[PDB]
Amino acid sequence: AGDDRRINLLVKSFIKWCNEEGYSQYQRMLSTLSQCEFSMGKTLLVYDMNLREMENYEKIYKEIECSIAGAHEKIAEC
């Protein structure tokens, strides 16, 4: 959401920089590159969180199978 707007703003700032002042523009471009690297690291962390959420969903499915076995044992106890 906001990361797409930040990436579009970084692309617009890079296009404006390509269009003391040069050193300040180079510092701003390095700042935009650092923000883009932070966004790429956030995307990699989001992918790792998606893989961990899939692993937790598989663990929840195994716990649901164990709870179905416990429900059969509770049916025998009932």
Binding site: A1, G2, Y23, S24, Q27, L30, S31, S34, Q35, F38, G41, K42, L45, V46, M49, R52, E53, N56, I60
Partner: protein, 266 residues
């Protein structure tokens, strides 16, 4: 100018020495991006709460940093950091809370979502009658979809099924760890009928549907007379509660009046 950035990263890596060696908007931008890089390294490598306390001591952008931290940490450390946020107390707060609502599946995390919404409020074999199952839960889907309660044929099925279910409820006459949602079980089917509180749920849902219909979008006046007749029969069946039938009936009357108040003011 990146030499000042490296000097800032040397000074921040305790907090009093960073505040002494920190000594006008672009320098603060380099400082905030240094905090971005250090927090990203700490997410790669608890300490995040310490850096958030440091930013709250020194200082916009900490909302973005906490949003990134809550996006990274899935389940447990997200809960501890949200308790830290509860200990701490613009649009970024609402964005973080909407992301927490959308990421959770509400299977066992409904308590955490309730704490989020409280924070937002602080901000602002046996023969089974399967036909009874099908008719009752088709009526339940009619309760779920009041938009479907505007047609003719769906209204006719609502009439027939509602009159049959209310006939069963009048013919029963019982005369006498928490389960979150409704139990769609074809197996037992009798513990819900023996519990009068389940019928209290169903008749409250009838009364809310009737008050919404009284509250295009037009109906036949004969249908409204049918609704009033069935509404009076619902008041009759709720007066038949052996613990405080008439008292709880007057309670529901007062609640209906107050719902009319909240509708007509808003």
């Amino acid at each position: 100018l990146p030499e000042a950035r490296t000097r800032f990263t040397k000074s921040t890596r305790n907090i009093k020495p960073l505040l002494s060696t920190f000594s006008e908007n672009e320098k603060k931008c380099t400082l905030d991006q240094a905090f971005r890089g250090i927090l990203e390294e700490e997410i790669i490598n608890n300490v995040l709460a310490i850096i958030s306390l440091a930013i709250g001591g020194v200082t916009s952008t900490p909302f973005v940093l906490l949003g990134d931290v809550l996006d990274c940490l899935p389940l447990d450390q997200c809960d501890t950091i949200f308790t830290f946020v509860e200990k701490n107390v613009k649009n970024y707060l609402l964005r973080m809370c909407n992301d927490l609502l959308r990421r959770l599946s509400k299977s066992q995390n409904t308590v955490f979502c309730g704490r989020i919404q409280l924070f937002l409020a602080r901000l602002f074999s046996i023969p089974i009658d399967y036909n009874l199952y099908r008719k009752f839960w088709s009526l339940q889907d009619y309760f779920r979809n009041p938009v479907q309660c505007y047609e003719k044929i769906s209204w006719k099925t609502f009439l027939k099924y509602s009159e049959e279910v209310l006939a069963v409820f009048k013919s029963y006459k019982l005369d006498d760890v928490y389960f979150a949602k409704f139990l769609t079980s074809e197996k037992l089917m009798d513990l819900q009928l023996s519990d009068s509180n389940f019928r209290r749920h169903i008749l409250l849902q009838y009364l809310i549907l009737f008050q919404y219909l009284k509250g295009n979008y037009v109906l036949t006046d004969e249908q409204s007379l049918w609704i009033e007749d069935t509404t009076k029969s619902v008041y009759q069946l709720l007066s038949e509660n052996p613990p405080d039938g008439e008292r709880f009936s007057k309670m529901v009357e007062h609640i209906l009046n107050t719902e009319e108040n909240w509708n007509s003011w808003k």
